[PDB]
Each structure stands twice: as C-alpha cells, then as structure tokens.
Amino acid sequence: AKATVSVKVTASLSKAWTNSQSGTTAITYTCDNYDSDEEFTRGCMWQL
Amino acid sequence: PTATWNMVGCDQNGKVSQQISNTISFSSTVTAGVAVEVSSTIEKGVIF
C-alpha cells in the first residue's frame, strides 16, 4: 500500500486591455394633433 | 435636384426629433491571485 501527500503553490499575474466603441440612434415621436387638426388631449398612438 | 435622402421617421400627427450618439471607451484590469492545494491519496495495490 502506497501513500502520498502533495503541497502545490501557484501565483498568477495577468493584464487585460479592452477598448470599445458604440453608436446609438434615438427617434422620438409625440402625439400633438388629430387628423382634424385639433389638439391631442387623449387617444392612441399607431405605428404602420 | 441632385442629392438623395434617407427617411428616418414620419409623424402624421406631431413632432419628430432624433438624437445621435457615439461612445468610445478604454478599460484595463490587473488581477493578482494566490492558491493553496493540499491533496492526499490512499492506494492499495498487490496482485493485480
């Protein structure tokens, strides 16, 4: 019968460099009037 | 008329506006680590 005991010591050092770029577009729509040309004070917004 | 235009949004009933954004970023990480492993094994082991 054989028997062993192991002791290991590790030490690490890394360095990461990240660079990134993004672009975003944002369109905003508001409900201001009905087709009749009166001011919008309630109702629904629709998308084609 | 020479130029050609792309449509970005239509609103039949009010305002349209846009915002265009660009981001550039640089990042870096430094990691330092240390590990201790203490293993052992029992193996028995005669005829066959």
Which two structure tokens, joined as six digits, stand for A38? Answer: 């009166």
Using an 8 Å Cβ cutoff, are B38 and A10 in contact? no
Which two structure tokens, joined as six digits, stand for B42? Answer: 């029992």
Q: Torsions phi, psi of B39, nearest 5?
A: -100, 170
Kindly provide the resolution of this structure in angstroms, with one decimal. 2.9
Using an 8 Å Cβ cutoff, are A46 and B26 in contact? no
- Give, for A14, the enclosing helix (H) or strand (E): strand A2-29
Method used to solve the structure: X-ray
- Give, for B21, the enclosing helix (H) or strand (E): strand B16-43
Tokens 């005829």 correspond to what residue? B47
- The dihedral over CA atoms of A29, A31, A37, A41, expressed in degrees to the nearest 10, equals -160
Using an 8 Å Cβ cutoff, are A38 and B17 in contact? no
Using an 8 Å Cβ cutoff, are B16 and A26 in contact? no
Nearest CA in chain A to B47: A1
Where residue B12 falls (left for φ over 0; alpha for ψ -120 to 50; beta otherwise) is: alpha
Which two structure tokens, joined as six digits, stand for B19? Answer: 């915002």
- List the single residue in B19, B23, B44 with the smallest CB-CB distance to A1: B44
Buried b (16+ CB within 10 A) or exposed e, A34-45: eeeeeeeeeeee
Nearest CA in chain A to B42: A3
Instruction: Report the length, in residues, of chain B.
Output: 48
DSSP state at residue B46: -
